Design a protein around this nucleic acid. Structure first.
Ligand SMILES: [Cl-]
Ligand SMILES: [Cl-]
Ligand SMILES: [Cl-]
Ligand SMILES: [K+]
Ligand SMILES: [Mg+2]
Ligand SMILES: [Mg+2]
Ligand SMILES: [Mg+2]
Ligand SMILES: [Mg+2]
Ligand SMILES: [Mg+2]
Ligand SMILES: [Mg+2]
Ligand SMILES: [Mg+2]
Ligand SMILES: [Mg+2]
Ligand SMILES: [Mg+2]
Ligand SMILES: [Mg+2]
Ligand SMILES: [Mg+2]
Ligand SMILES: [Mg+2]
Ligand SMILES: [Mg+2]
Ligand SMILES: [Mg+2]
Ligand SMILES: [Mg+2]
Ligand SMILES: [Mg+2]
Ligand SMILES: [Mg+2]
Ligand SMILES: [Mg+2]
Ligand code: NA
Ligand code: NA
Ligand code: NA
Ligand code: NA
Ligand code: NA
Ligand code: NA
Ligand code: NA
Ligand code: NA
Ligand code: NA
Ligand code: NA
Ligand code: NA
Ligand code: NA
Ligand SMILES: [Sr+2]
Ligand SMILES: [Sr+2]
Ligand SMILES: [Sr+2]
Ligand SMILES: [Sr+2]
Ligand SMILES: [Sr+2]
Ligand SMILES: [Sr+2]
Ligand SMILES: [Sr+2]
Ligand SMILES: [Sr+2]
Ligand SMILES: [Sr+2]
Lengths: 194, 46, 119, 237
RNA sequence: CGCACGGAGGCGAAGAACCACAGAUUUCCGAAUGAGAAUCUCUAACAAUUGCUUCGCGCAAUGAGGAACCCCGAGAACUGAAACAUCUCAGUAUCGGGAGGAACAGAAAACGCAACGUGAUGUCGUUAGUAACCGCGAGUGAACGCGAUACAGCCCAAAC
RNA sequence: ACUCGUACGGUCACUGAAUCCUGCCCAGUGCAGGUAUCUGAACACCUCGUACAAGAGGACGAAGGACCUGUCAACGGCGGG
RNA sequence: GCUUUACUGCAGGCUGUCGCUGAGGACUCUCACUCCGGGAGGAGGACACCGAUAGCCGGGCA
């Protein structure tokens, strides 16, 4: 039958209706007063967490990040940068907020590696994401048959090289066919036209 | 000006590098110190 | 808190937890929010326990309404780890279920009643 | 062109900042839980660099030493009181309500508890007019009717040092010295005496702004100079 | 008994020189980490940030370097268009972050020679200056397929 | 930043000690204020259109503008017959 | 380099609208949110702030 999990999930399908609506209105007040990276004992969205790879083990950390909202905060132009080149309040950046989050998080934890992240709400001027990080040095995880992969030296700073799932989903790598000619196998490998 | 202990050791070394190529090297090599620094004409770091 | 709609008197809770310990040592019980859930869905639940000190509240939010559309009676427990120890576990639990009591059916019966009276 | 002087200002560089390190105190209303059992005695009457007005040094019943904005009158040896029950004499401080209508007050709080905001200049003074269980209308030195929460504390009497504005500086030197102790750049070069590249009014083969001086409120910094959103100009008419 | 053929002297048949490997020693500054400092000084140090935790720095991690390569971000102008704004130069130069001996990609919500067809991924040859774009100007410009290289497929979440 | 500041303040401009004075002009331009009426984008909204969408018309209508007033120690003007 | 009622744009100010945003064409409210207060608590209040968009102005700038 339905798993208790499928309930948490089925609820966040519309974080603005019912109990969850009352929760967020409350939590946020507390959230809005927390740092920019708060570690938390348990994931707010359990289904999602586990689903994304979470495990109630040793070395599996969760942290809620809070990034300022908006689009782009771009200066005008020092020298003589023409019209098509005067970006300031009408353009946005090529990296989505969740990626910014994942990064700030991994920095706060200079030894942990990003596993994944999820949204947990957003008031009128900031977005919150919980990021699942992992200690590649705790044997507790070095042994785990489902997570020991995140230990390869070539997984170091995996988030800063866009290896997160959201990382890849942003580098235009979702589709295996049409419209991904300039993305895969690498944006840089494609003279950045993706 | 006041010189520190290091600033001194250095100035010391620098003064020493200012010696001539010992007579014997001339012979042992059958034939010039390209680093002769004069207190007036040249200039040391710091 | 958001899933709680009535406070269960210190005394009443005690009884509930007391009954639970003999429930494991007689009939049967489910330990864990997930196990508790299915039981309510399968109907094989007579009395379900839900901790009040849970966070994220997500985990349990559903219980109160799912048990109401399944008749199954339920009771709140101020603290999480007590329910865990009351179900005989090293690490506290957020929700437990009394799957067919045992030499407690008399109590359960009343407790379930005592709460109905508690609105 | 280049940024104009007004734009350089904002940057907050030395030249533009005020010699704060040479300033005495942030004159604010002492605090009392409530009641009124607070009153010290005037120990000194000093000169505050930041305002060119006099400021009294008061010592309280508890042994607290703090400078207070000196209203005309307050001499040394005198005792002033602070609180809701504080006697209604020149120098003492108490919420607007407790103050009898038609009485000149200075150093008036905008938000009850801020510590004084209005009327603090030399010889200036506010006037308490209307009283209510809600609002306490006060006429400020500019002649404006400022409705205030009766809980806003104020001091009784005009700010000492009045009339300073009545004697002409006579010479730049004097002006120079005053300025040297204020967050102000000096002297003042006229916009029209500058190069086009330096100011909206610069350039030309003779001084004269090449535009009407009254500028739109919406003007952007760098362009907003001369008569800002003037509702009119000239003396007559 | 270095470059480096001198003087004096010394070492080597106790097998030196010399070479390969492994080891010892390895001052101070230096990521530089007890604190400060133009390589020195002052009175026990994983400083700072983290994970685990006997909650004790007890056990661990990070930091910085490297010719270029690689990956993720930020992102010009000269110039071309015989001027010039879109366009071009060009996602080039330059900057910020990060990994490895290779990186990235990768086992289809694919393809669509529409089929009774193919069957992860890079890459090379071609497809092709084709389709497509574009003050439809100057210019820009793929893919499926094919021939090759190499080939290798798997693990969770949930149900129980 | 101004600001340990508060209209006897400080900001932005002009003229340039004292003394005697500082005329007329608000049409244009600027600034400011008002405004029946008119004009005035997008969203939501009505009608039609499309099994949806592109779309057609309507409706309401902000600042702004029209329009009206104030202002020249505001840009400036002070002729011909 | 500089100017402007040259061309084209951008900051920026003004304004409508959408989100933040809640309870009962004019209104009440308090609970988010903002400000004052050491605090208790006070003021303000779904406005303001901020994200987005739309119209006007826009040599301050390119
Ligand atoms: Cl990472
Ligand atoms: Cl002055
Ligand atoms: Cl095929
Ligand atoms: K160009
Ligand atoms: Mg010598
Ligand atoms: Mg003060
Ligand atoms: Mg003056
Ligand atoms: Mg000065
Ligand atoms: Mg001048
Ligand atoms: Mg000049
Ligand atoms: Mg100019
Ligand atoms: Mg002149
Ligand atoms: Mg003049
Ligand atoms: Mg050190
Ligand atoms: Mg050209
Ligand atoms: Mg490649
Ligand atoms: Mg042409
Ligand atoms: Mg191109
Ligand atoms: Mg294709
Ligand atoms: Mg002159
Ligand atoms: Mg504050
Ligand atoms: Mg220009
Ligand atoms: Na890290
Ligand atoms: Na693209
Ligand atoms: Na010298
Ligand atoms: Na060595
Ligand atoms: Na270390
Ligand atoms: Na420790
Ligand atoms: Na040309
Ligand atoms: Na040219
Ligand atoms: Na073009
Ligand atoms: Na006129
Ligand atoms: Na004239
Ligand atoms: Na020039
Ligand atoms: Sr690293
Ligand atoms: Sr010399
Ligand atoms: Sr626990
Ligand atoms: Sr204060
Ligand atoms: Sr103050
Ligand atoms: Sr001029
Ligand atoms: Sr006149
Ligand atoms: Sr294959
Ligand atoms: Sr006029």
């Amino acid at each position: 039958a339905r798993s208790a999990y499928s309930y948490i999930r089925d609820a966040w399908k519309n974080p603005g209706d019912g109990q969850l609506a009352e929760l967020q209105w409350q939590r946020q007040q507390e959230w809005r007063n927390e740092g920019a990276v708060e570690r938390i004992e348990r994931p707010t969205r359990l289904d999602k967490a586990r689903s994304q790879g979470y495990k109630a083990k040793q070395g599996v950390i969760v942290a809620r990040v809070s990034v300022r909202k908006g689009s782009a905060r771009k200066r005008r132009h020092k020298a003589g940068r023409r019209s098509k080149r005067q970006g300031v309040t009408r353009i946005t950046r090529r990296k989505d907020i969740q990626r910014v989050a994942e990064e700030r998080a991994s920095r706060t934890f200079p030894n942990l590696r990003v596993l994944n992240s999820y949204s947990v709400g957003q008031d009128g001027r900031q977005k919150w994401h919980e990021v699942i990080l992992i200690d590649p040095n705790h044997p507790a995880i070095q042994n785990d048959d489902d997570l020991s992969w995140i230990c390869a030296d070539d997984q170091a700073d995996r988030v800063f090289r866009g290896l997160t799932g959201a990382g890849r989903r942003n580098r235009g790598l979702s589709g295996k066919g049409k419209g991904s000619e300039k993305t895969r196998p690498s944006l840089r490998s494609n003279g950045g036209k993706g | 000006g006041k010189k520190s202990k290091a600033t001194k050791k250095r100035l010391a070394k620098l003064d020493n590098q200012n010696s001539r190529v010992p007579a014997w090297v001339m012979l042992k090599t059958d034939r010039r110190n390209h680093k002769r620094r004069h207190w007036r004409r040249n200039d040391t770091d710091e | 808190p958001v899933y709680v709609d009535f406070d269960v008197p210190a005394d009443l809770e005690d009884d509930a937890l007391e009954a639970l310990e003999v429930a494991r040592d007689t009939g049967a019980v489910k330990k864990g929010t997930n196990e508790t859930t299915k039981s309510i869905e399968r109907g094989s639940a007579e009395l379900v326990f839900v901790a009040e000190d849970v966070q994220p509240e997500e985990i349990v939010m559903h219980i109160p309404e799912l048990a109401d559309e399944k008749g199954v009676p339920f009771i709140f427990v101020e603290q999480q780890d007590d329910l865990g120890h009351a179900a005989g576990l090293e690490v506290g639990s957020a929700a437990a279920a009394v799957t067919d009591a045992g030499e407690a059916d008399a109590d359960v019966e009343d407790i379930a009643d005592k709460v109905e009276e508690l609105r | 062109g280049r940024r104009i002087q007004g734009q350089r200002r904002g940057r907050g560089t030395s030249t533009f900042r005020a010699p704060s390190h040479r300033y005495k105190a942030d004159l604010e209303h002492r605090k009392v839980e409530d009641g009124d059992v607070i009153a010290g005695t005037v120990v000194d009457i000093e000169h505050d660099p930041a305002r060119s007005a006099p400021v009294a040094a008061v010592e309280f019943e508890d042994g607290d030493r703090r400078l207070i904005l000196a209203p005309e009158g307050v001499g040394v040896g005198d005792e002033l009181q602070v609180g809701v029950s504080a006697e209604i004499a020149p120098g003492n401080t108490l919420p607007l309500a407790e103050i009898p209508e038609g009485v000149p007050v200075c150093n008036v709080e905008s938000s009850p508890g801020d510590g004084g905001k209005f009327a603090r200049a030399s010889g200036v003074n506010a006037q308490l007019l209307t009283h209510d269980r809600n609002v306490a209308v006060v006429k400020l030195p500019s002649g404006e009717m400022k409705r205030l929460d009766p809980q806003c504390r104020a001091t009784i009497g005009v700010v000492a040092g009045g009339g300073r504005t009545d004697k002409p500086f006579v010479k730049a030197g004097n002006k120079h010295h005053k300025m040297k102790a204020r967050g102000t750049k000096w002297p003042n070069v006229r916009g029209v005496a500058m190069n086009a590249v330096d100011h909206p009014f610069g350039g030309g083969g003779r001084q004269h702004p090449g535009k009407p001086k009254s500028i739109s409120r919406n003007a952007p910094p760098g362009r907003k100079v001369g008569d800002i959103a003037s509702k009119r100009t000239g003396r007559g008419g």
